[PDB]
Amino acid sequence: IQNSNSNTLTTTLNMNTVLTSIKNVQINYTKNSGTVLPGYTPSVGFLGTSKPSLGFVFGSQDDVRYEAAKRGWLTTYQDFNQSFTQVSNKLLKVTANIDLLPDLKVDLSMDRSYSENTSEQYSVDPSTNEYKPLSPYTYGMFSISTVMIKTAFSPSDETQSAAFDDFRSNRLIIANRLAEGHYGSGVAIPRYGDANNPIPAETDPNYAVYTANQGYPIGYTKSNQAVLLPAFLAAYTGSDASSSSTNIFRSFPIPNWSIKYNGLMRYKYFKDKFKRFSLQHNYRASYTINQFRSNFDYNSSPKVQDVNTNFYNEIIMSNVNLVEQFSPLIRMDFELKSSLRVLSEIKKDRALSMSFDNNLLTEVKGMEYIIGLGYRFKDVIF
């Protein structure tokens, strides 16, 4: 049996009819869902069925596994290889318009996508007919519109990067915060350099790991994903690591903006040799996790540290992307009364990608200057 939902909501919310600047608040919310439940023994009728639940036939997405097992219409095979599966997708597309000045138009956008797949095998206990989950796991995608302009114009090249220095520095702050979250301040936080955890001899394989970070907490090294992901986000968003969010996902999208200004022409350019003048600016930034998934190593067993002496993380991903784009950073499009029109445009972008497979930062920067002149010499005689 398969189930699917395609929820969709659209709201214009015309703010019309000091805060009267906002005009329209366009809100789009799409929510797809789906459920695949194999091993469903009973058949269907001529006109259909409502045997699992009347909601499931119309897409309730509520838990029907345990009810189906209790009522006894799940397979009694104890080696069932088919997996119960659930899919969910959320898309939020908030949009707004602001008119702070008569010749100044502002467009704000807020984007948030979250996809989640859960898969699990199952059994039914021969006695009491109880549903038994077996090795459930989760994966999916995440993306949210953010603002990272606080570090956009900081110079970053082969020889210097203030944002990368902040990324280096925030690791210890985030590690200390995570250790205080883990060790509840009732005892001194164990560290790689203290007496209880001394630096081993040069033969021990952990000698290099222990030496590379002596003042860090035992479970939170410089290479821990949970340590350097919030550090990366705080460093390249301009936030302070002492209070920045340590969570993998974000809840509130940060608006991206587009500003148009046909305002300077109103000042004195009516007869100042200008017949057109407009400024344009765009900023769009996104923070994306292409594939996160649950960790089978994060379980109830006493084994809590990996080969790198890092605590196992609940959710693991290979890469995180911070994409920033001024498209354009500026656009001056002005036509003179002498038929000379000039369109200048500065565009900028950053494509930071932090990889936890090798703990490397790949920064792709791009700058583009475009200049366009148009002139018409009048009555040229050959």
Partner: protein, 128 residues
């Protein structure tokens, strides 16, 4: 930064548990309470061990099970095991009363809430 402290609560809970069930447990300077039922014929921080342990809560609800010998590095485990296992030889059995800070911490994980005392019965069968 909204941390909790559980040292005193765990200590008093362990004292209450040892009052309810007539067991005498020696105290480690880190707060670990252990009872060695028997020894055999010590494993270090770099040593692979095999255990048939079983771990439960105060109420007796078992949170982790191992009826067959499972191999661990003894350096990847919780601190309570790191302080309890090196106290005995192969074939010996111990009962640990690991607090939160020596266990899964003040935040816990799935099925183990933060600030939970963990009672382990460990039978070390191999130090290979």
């Amino acid at each position: 930064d909204e941390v909790k402290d559980y040292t005193a609560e765990n200590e008093k809970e362990i004292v209450d548990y040892l009052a309810q069930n007539n067991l005498t447990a020696q105290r480690t300077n880190s707060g670990l309470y252990y009872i060695i039922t028997k020894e055999g014929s010590h494993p270090t921080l770099n040593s692979n061990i095999t255990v048939i342990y079983k771990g439960y809560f105060t109420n007796g609800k078992v949170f982790d099970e191992s009826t067959e010998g499972v191999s661990y590095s003894l350096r990847t485990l919780i601190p309570g095991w790191k302080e309890g296992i090196p106290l005995l030889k192969s074939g010996g059995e111990i009962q640990l009363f690991v607090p939160a800070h020596l266990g899964y911490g003040s935040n816990g994980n799935k099925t183990v809430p933060g600030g939970a005392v963990l009672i382990f019965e460990i039978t070390l069968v191999s130090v290979n």
